[PDB]
């Protein structure tokens, strides 16, 4: 289907159906629309490094893609990868202009190592996103701290 | 929406860009004002009537449709989603020939 859009009334949350339109839903300004990025650790995912690395993997034939998210959650655990292959060459791409590290991290797990980079880019096995500064990417960037999460789109109440 | 995640953090300590009070003097000038890591404002939303745990699940279910939307597009960085959602919102209501008495039309005679 199309991208689900959550609608908030008071403290209740509903999912806007395309076929059924609710006139009670009011949108007076684009400033009511808000895109939120929520971390995976909030779902009870293991934050330890070996469990995390197992959630990531390399692949080729898949271009990298990026979205913008306007607001995010403070992360207890973030990650920063700097890894190569036996020949000493980097297997992770440099963060292109505009992509910075996740703005809020308590503990940042700096990771180094070497291995068989079996792909051009490193994606998320579970389909989640690597959240950066107001940008969620499908790929890990070199040397830039990140937190892994997912994005939701909202239409806030009458403010 | 009903959270199906094994655990759910009810407390949402969040950060964002949009501010409240623009009058901090000249701090709006890029030469002055916050560095890259100071532009943010923080807040705390509580799990009122399972709102947060609802959002958490919503973010999970949205992932599929979102990931496919990105596959379709060829642009590297997509910022146009929210404006697109705003347009679809209007088209839904006014696409459109509007019958007052009938449904799919938000008008009242009073």
């Amino acid at each position: 289907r199309s991208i689900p859009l959550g609608v908030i009334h008071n403290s209740t949350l509903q999912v806007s159906d395309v076929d059924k339109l609710v006139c009670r839903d009011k949108l007076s300004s684009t400033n009511q629309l808000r895109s939120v990025g929520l971390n995976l650790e909030g779902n009870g995912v293991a934050t330890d490094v070996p469990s995390a690395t197992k959630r990531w993997g390399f692949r080729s034939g898949v271009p990298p893609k990026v979205v913008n998210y306007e607001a995010g959650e403070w992360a207890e655990n973030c990650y920063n990868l700097e890894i190569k292959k036996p020949d000493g060459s980097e297997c992770l791409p440099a963060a292109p202009d505009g992509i910075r590290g996740f703005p809020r991290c308590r503990y940042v797990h700096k990771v180094s190592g070497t291995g068989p980079c079996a792909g051009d880019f490193a994606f998320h096995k579970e389909g989640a996103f690597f959240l950066y500064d107001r940008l969620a990417s499908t790929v890990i960037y070199r040397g830039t701290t990140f937190a892994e999460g997912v994005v939701a789109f909202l239409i806030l109440p009458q403010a | 929406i009903v959270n199906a995640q094994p655990k759910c953090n009810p407390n949402l300590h969040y950060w964002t860009t949009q501010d409240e009070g623009a009058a901090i003097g000249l701090a709006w000038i890029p030469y002055f004002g916050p560095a890259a890591e100071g532009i943010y404002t923080e807040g705390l939303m509580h799990n009122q009537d399972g709102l947060i745990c609802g959002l958490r699940q919503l973010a999970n279910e949205t992932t599929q449709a979102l990931q496919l939307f990105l596959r379709a597009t060829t642009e590297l960085r997509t910022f146009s989603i929210l404006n697109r959602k705003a347009i679809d919102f209007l088209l839904q209501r006014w696409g459109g020939t509007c019958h007052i008495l009938g449904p799919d039309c938000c008008i009242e005679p009073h």
Epitope: - | V2, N3, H46, N47, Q48, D49, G50, I52, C53
Partner: antibody
Framework: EVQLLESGGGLVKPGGSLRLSCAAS????????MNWVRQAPGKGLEWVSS????????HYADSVKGRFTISRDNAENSLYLQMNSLRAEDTAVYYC??????????????????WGQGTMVTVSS | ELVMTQSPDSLAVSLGERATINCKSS????????????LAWYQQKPGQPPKLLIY???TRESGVPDRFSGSGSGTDFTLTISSLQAEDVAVYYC?????????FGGGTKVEIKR
């Protein structure tokens, strides 16, 4: 760290009234939906009442409807239940209970992950 | 109003051997959207309030030892204790939180054979 301290209860005559109190520590009541659960002497558990964070969505057991009125104070981090027109069948141990964070008055419920120490309520002439 | 039924009412097993407790609901507690069975298990020792053991029928709560494990879906469910030991002597209740009013089973008393 996380716990619930209960007050009130005791002896009361049939038709009398009592007010159970429950004070939370280690978390904020705003995040969770609170419940009351009773347990008659030597018998099983019976759900009594529930109240959402916003205090918007409230529910009682049919056997209790109209006689009990549940309430909460998020700022004071407390939960209260006022019981009126008490009778013998209400004689039981009343537990202050926290429901999971996934519970909402307008959707599916959640489990009772934290239980209070309990308080004895005896209805007798 | 769902009626939860536990069996057996009482059970006595030798230390180190396994014990199983059944639970039967009047109606299916399976949520179509989640494919999650909304059922919970509690432990209540004498003079103490209940303690959460299992939620969503199969998922152990944090801190519950591995020997506790639940299973089943829809109508029939089971709580299983492998290697009973001493600290597991209690009354075990099953509960549905699929639809209101939330209801408990009659409870099962687990004792040790000596």
């Amino acid at each position: 760290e996380v716990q619930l301290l209960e007050s009130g209860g005791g002896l009361v005559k049939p038709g009398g009234s009592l007010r159970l109190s429950c004070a939370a520590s280690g978390f904020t009541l705003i995040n969770y939906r609170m419940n009351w659960v009773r347990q008659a002497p030597g018998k099983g558990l019976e759900w009594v009442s529930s109240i959402s964070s916003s205090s918007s969505y409230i529910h009682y057991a049919d056997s209790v409807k109209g006689r009990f009125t549940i309430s909460r104070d998020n700022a004071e981090n407390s939960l209260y239940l006022q019981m009126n027109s008490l009778r013998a069948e209400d004689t039981a141990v009343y537990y202050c209970v926290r429901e999971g964070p996934r519970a909402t008055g307008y959707s599916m419920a959640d489990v009772f992950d934290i239980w209070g120490q309990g308080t004895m309520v005896t209805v007798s002439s | 109003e769902l009626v939860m039924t536990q069996s057996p009412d009482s059970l006595a097993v030798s230390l180190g051997e396994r014990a199983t407790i059944n639970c039967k609901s009047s109606q299916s507690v399976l949520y179509s959207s989640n494919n999650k069975s909304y059922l919970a298990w509690y432990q209540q020792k004498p003079g103490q309030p209940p303690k959460l053991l299992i939620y969503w029928a199969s998922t152990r709560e944090s801190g519950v030892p591995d020997r506790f494990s639940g299973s089943g879906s829809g109508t029939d469910f089971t709580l299983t204790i492998s290697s009973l030991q001493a600290e597991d002597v209690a009354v075990y209740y099953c509960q549905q939180y699929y639809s209101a009013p939330l209801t408990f089973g009659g409870g099962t008393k687990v004792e040790i054979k000596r």
